Amino acid sequence: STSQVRQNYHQDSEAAINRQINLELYASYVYLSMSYYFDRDDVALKNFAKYFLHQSHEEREHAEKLMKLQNQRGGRIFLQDIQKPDCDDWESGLNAMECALHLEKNVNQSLLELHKLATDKNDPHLCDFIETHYLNEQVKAIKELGDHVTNLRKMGAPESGLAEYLFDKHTLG
Amino acid sequence: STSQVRQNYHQDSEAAINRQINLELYASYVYLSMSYYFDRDDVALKNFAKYFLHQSHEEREHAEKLMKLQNQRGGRIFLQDIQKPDCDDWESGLNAMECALHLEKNVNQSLLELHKLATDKNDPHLCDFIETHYLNEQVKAIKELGDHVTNLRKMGAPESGLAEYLFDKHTLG
Amino acid sequence: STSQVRQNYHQDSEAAINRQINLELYASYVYLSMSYYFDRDDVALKNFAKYFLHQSHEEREHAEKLMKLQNQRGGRIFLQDIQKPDCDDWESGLNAMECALHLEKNVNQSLLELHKLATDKNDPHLCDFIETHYLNEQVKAIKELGDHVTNLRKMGAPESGLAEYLFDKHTLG
Amino acid sequence: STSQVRQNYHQDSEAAINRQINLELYASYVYLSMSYYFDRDDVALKNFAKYFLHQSHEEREHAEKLMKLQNQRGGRIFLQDIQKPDCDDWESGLNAMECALHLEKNVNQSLLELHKLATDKNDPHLCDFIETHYLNEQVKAIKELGDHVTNLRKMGAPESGLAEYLFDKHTLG
Amino acid sequence: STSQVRQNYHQDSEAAINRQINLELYASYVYLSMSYYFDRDDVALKNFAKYFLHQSHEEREHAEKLMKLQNQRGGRIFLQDIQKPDCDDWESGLNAMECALHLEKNVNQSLLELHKLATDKNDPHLCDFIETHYLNEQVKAIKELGDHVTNLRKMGAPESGLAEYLFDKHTLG
Amino acid sequence: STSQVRQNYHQDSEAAINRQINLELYASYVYLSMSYYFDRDDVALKNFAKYFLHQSHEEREHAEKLMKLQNQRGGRIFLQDIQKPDCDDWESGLNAMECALHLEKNVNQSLLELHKLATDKNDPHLCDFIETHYLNEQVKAIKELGDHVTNLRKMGAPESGLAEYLFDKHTLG
């Protein structure tokens, strides 16, 4: 039953990787929803839409890299349903950025727990995989989203549609 | 409540588009599963894996184009859960190709029903959208998959692992 | 007696590095033997030979990088005899690939023990050296060898000399 | 009070980063002093001066990267006075190189303690930041300085002004 | 005791140069603090940050040129502690620009006193050094900062976060 | 049992080739030891290290060419243990060069005996292989090492660390 390549790869780590794959696919779907919200004719913030579509594709890439990891270690991928995002209508550029920040922090928390598990199972390859490919990416993403939220708020979002317009132009464009 | 851009776009068409979006996202996820099945160390068919990953990304592109359509017409996207694929283990190159063929034919059937609905609602824009972007693509995909299945079977798949090996090299590589 | 550069470098880590150097040199020599086995006129698999010669040189590079590490930390290299490989005749492409897989897993196990020792001695530089330069390399090498073994077996190696011939051409060539 | 981006970043780590920033700025200032010592008309070792000025600028870069880290994690930078270096007159090329070696080892010790703290607080992002950007840099710097000191001593520094002259020309030039 | 190169270089001028070196290093450190204030996630004015970092590096260059002068004339550099800046939190883009203006005017006043001293000691080389490299630079810097402050105030800084946002984009970007 | 390609290739020649392969691998390992001796922080002669590493790789190439010969003639390679070098610490640039000279002369003596054996067995292919690829190489290597030893001695090695320093720079650099 054991893969010929498997070495020092605990069942708990394999299961946690499968959960992280699902979470990354979920994040990609959340960002897809946000993108096309901003593509609505009654929202019409093209650069918000582009920003979130880029994030969606990046999240898909993260999921695929985890799947590649799983196969590299000799674990077996078990996919689950990708739940629909919590919202259909993201209300505003600022609200979407705040939800993105919350999402990225949740993903980061899951990654930190994954690292803790790897450490407990003395899986240095897994630990360094997470460190190299995920944790700094997450820190950067959180910092960027926080900067965006700060700017929107200082500009007067979401009540100032001019605020969101100019942010779309000058920051995201 | 009605979008300022909406014109000659029936509620039934909007709902059918939302269903097609979900179906395309589902197909993308199926192909993703197949790709990483072939990436397993105990399967190890790199070009099968590449082929199905390409298909996965293409299906995502199809879904996004439908979302763009929905917004263009002034309908509203409502996302649903993306169900996990029917299999974790796709058994063989031939079996995966046959399942892909079945999937593509199901997608085609859904597209044909969408066209029929558009026609019944006298929505020529929608009809020609489907015709231009989807129906021929589907016909081509089905023909290609049928050709692949035919070749694998004639070569002796799935019992001839040499068969699948050489198909991976010479057709998909 | 203590090197002017030495800092946070335990005697046990220094000794373990010397053992790893010997192991890497041993692996290089094993791969050299395999390469020239496939260079025999009665075996005559040029691409197997090339593959294993490449691996031999890579293993030498790994050993030299460990020697460089040893000097960087202010430890002292102590070389030992390089034992001859366990076989003169590697029997088949498949058998050689399986022995290579076993060898790479043994090297990986030694690296994991080295990492555990470094961690126990709170030597983060050493830990990250191992993580960055060795562990992922090992995981990749094991995955690649497992893929090769899987393909050869599915093709019908080692009884199908046609199998090995075509693998030599299409995978290793 | 808590930054919107802050996650898994302990107050003790934040304080330790602020201390490391100060230490890096101090090291930059030490190297600046050494550089301009060698720029004196009665010392006149241009390549020593260039070497230490380069080191000064590199140390400033290290400090700024730590400040960037601090902001990325949502900690707050608190700057302190930069103490003047211990010497105005560095006596000789050899003496300056030895003091540089001592300084680099002190910086390394502080980094190791920072890593230990990060580990104790289960801050893998911080650990890997230190590992990736600082620890190997330090090991290299210490090895290089030790090599320089060894060469100067073997050449006959500091009594052989010819020794320092030729080292300036051939190693540092 | 007297340097072989020293000619027409009064002890008072040497001491005043040492004081100016310290002041330039202090200004560099002030600008560094301001830069990383604007790098905070809750401030998030990237172009303010870049502007002040550039100023910090320029101030370092000014200090190093004074050190070079000191050695050229045969004076001896005596470094002092670099005091921490007066603020940790610079409150706003406008407030930081006003503090920068005040700082630059203080530096200018010190330079003017240095010139007066040089003149009194009949040190035309020193006078022209100051004139050529420092005084016009200061005048320009003060004029630029005054222009910035004027614009921010007219735009509605610091209460209009939109004001600072657009200034960051259009003037400093 | 006899290889299909074997012609005019005596068992004694085959055995002597296997011994020469081992000797070449041994020489490679000796040079590797010397290289990393000079890489020590307390020796720190980078160009000595580079010179000996180059020699190590060249010796490995010689061994591989002999293995290729063995297979070309239809003999069978039998590898033996590679003994560790006689020294861990090579004491000085001059001492290492003298040991290298002794080693190269021993290798040359073995080659001359190999040629004599080939001649006695009327194996002109083997004789000319040795002549073309090995004997002149050896003569050159011995002459070069003798020149190096002569220069070091005249310069005052090994007591003059300046001597070795300048030789490292000007001859080996």
Ligand SMILES: [Mg+2]
């Ligand atoms: Mg074929």
Ligand SMILES: [Mg+2]
């Ligand atoms: Mg790491």
Ligand code: NA
């Ligand atoms: Na992600």
Ligand code: NA
């Ligand atoms: Na499709």
Ligand code: NA
């Ligand atoms: Na290795």
Ligand code: NA
């Ligand atoms: Na540093």
Ligand code: NA
């Ligand atoms: Na200045």
Ligand code: NA
């Ligand atoms: Na040789």
